[PDB]
Structure 1
Amino acid sequence: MTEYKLVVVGACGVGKSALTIQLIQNHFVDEYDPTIEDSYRKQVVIDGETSLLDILDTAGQEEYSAMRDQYMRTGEGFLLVFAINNTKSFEDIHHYREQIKRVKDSEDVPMVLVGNKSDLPSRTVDTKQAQDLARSYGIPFIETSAKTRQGVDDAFYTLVREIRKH
């Protein structure tokens, strides 16, 4: 029926792959490969509409440097992923959003802010900070854990709804 091109971005080690592998394969992996950059596919039904998801898991490992802008330009929605124990990954978020906007040539682009690794005890970024950042952009914030699967389906499903709103 419908095809949705999703892109998962965020700093190294936040859990972009872990989140993607959980959605499509329903398991958490003991050793991930940080170099792999590939598109993955998930079929879902949202609002009585079959949806095929073409999920691009970015890792900074493009064949050619020109593919960065092709990823953005061809992507319909973007998952802005940071880790709740990594302050630097949270601060990177505003850099990712501006570049997406810039190369897309648009102010309204479907995005969801995702705070991953909620299961961890040591946290440096609070929900309020992330919610205030998400509100300032006018997008939802969903807290996730790829380890427990908490909020993982809600993250991607909410992004598909945001794309339908565009």
Structure 2
Amino acid sequence: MTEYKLVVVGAGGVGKSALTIQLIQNHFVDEYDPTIEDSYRKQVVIDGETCLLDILDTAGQEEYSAMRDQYMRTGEGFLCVFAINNTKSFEDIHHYREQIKRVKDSEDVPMVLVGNKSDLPSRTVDTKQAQDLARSYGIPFIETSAKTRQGVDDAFYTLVREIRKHKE
């Protein structure tokens, strides 16, 4: 079956681990060591076809590591995550997108902008702001909650579909 290599990037605290663990293991985890980088694996059916997802969940201290570099070079698509209640994490999005463009040496990189923690009412980033940013990057914007599962499959499977079209 076809395999897809996905990488979840964004500032610490935005919910990368929670989004990934929710997708892979179907549980919301409120206390996951922010310093753990790990790859996760799941067999899923997307548009009728069984796929294997391999997902790197990133920790900040590994950002410039050689081993991170190898995963980024081979990564086929990227979720750029911020939290809708944290303006700083939204401000940081360009940093992650820039790193991806550089490592892939490409303007044609499958990516989705993810606004996580949509269940929280203390919003500080507007959907219109993120949609504008996503449009400027040529990518979709998907709202998620790792807590309620809102949008979680949609974010990952949208990225997969983008990789699939990029390859095929």
Distance in 1 of aligned mates of 2:30 and 2:164 = 35
User: 2:18, 2:30 within 8 Å by CA — same for their partners in 1?
Assistant: no
What SS does structure 2 have at the residue aligned with 1:90? helix
User: 1:5, 1:54 within 8 Å by CA — same for their partners in 2?
Assistant: yes
What SS does structure 2 have at the residue aligned with 1:61? helix
What SS does structure 1 have at the residue aligned with 2:68? helix
Deviation for aligned residue 1:9: 0.3
Unaligned runs of 5+ in 1: none
Judging changes above 3 Å, is the alpha-carbon distance between structure 1 residues 64 and 22 closer, same or farther for their aligned structure 2 residues? same
Distance in 2 of aligned mates of 1:68 and 1:20 = 17
Deviation for aligned residue 1:63: 10
1:90 matched residue in structure 2: 90
Distance in 1 of aligned mates of 2:29 and 2:60 = 20
Judging changes above 3 Å, is the alpha-carbon distance between structure 1 residues 64 and 127 closer, same or farther for their aligned structure 2 residues? closer
What SS does structure 2 have at the residue aligned with 1:108? coil
Match runs of 1:38-117 below 5 Å:
38-62=38-62, 65-117=65-117
CA offsets per residue over residues 31-87 of structure 1, 9 Å max, x none? Answer: 221111110011111233211000000012449821232121010000000000111
User: 2:11, 2:60 within 8 Å by CA — same for their partners in 1?
Assistant: no
User: 1:7, 1:75 within 8 Å by CA — same for their partners in 2?
Assistant: yes
What SS does structure 1 have at the residue aligned with 2:85? coil
What SS does structure 1 have at the residue aligned with 2:80? strand
Distance in 2 of aligned mates of 1:150 and 1:65 = 32
Which segment is superposed worse, 84-93 or 29-38? 29-38
Which segment is superposed worse, 41-50 or 5-14? 41-50
Judging changes above 3 Å, is the alpha-carbon distance between structure 1 residues 76 and 122 closer, same or farther for their aligned structure 2 residues? same
Distance in 2 of aligned mates of 1:145 and 1:63 = 24
Judging changes above 3 Å, is the alpha-carbon distance between structure 1 residues 78 and 127 closer, same or farther for their aligned structure 2 residues? same
Unaligned runs of 5+ in 2: none
RMSD: 1.4
Distance in 2 of aligned mates of 1:72 and 1:136 = 22
2:133 matched residue in structure 1: 133
TM-score in terms of structure 1 length: 0.95
Which segment is superposed worse, 66-75 or 137-146? 66-75
CA offsets per residue over residues 64-111 of structure 1, 9 Å max, x none? Answer: 821232121010000000000111110111111111111211111000
What SS does structure 2 have at the residue aligned with 1:115? strand
In the TM superposition, structure 1's runs of 4+ consecutive aligned residues that sit over 3 Å from their partners are 61-64
Judging changes above 3 Å, is the alpha-carbon distance between structure 1 residues 109 and 12 closer, same or farther for their aligned structure 2 residues? same
TM-score in terms of structure 2 length: 0.94
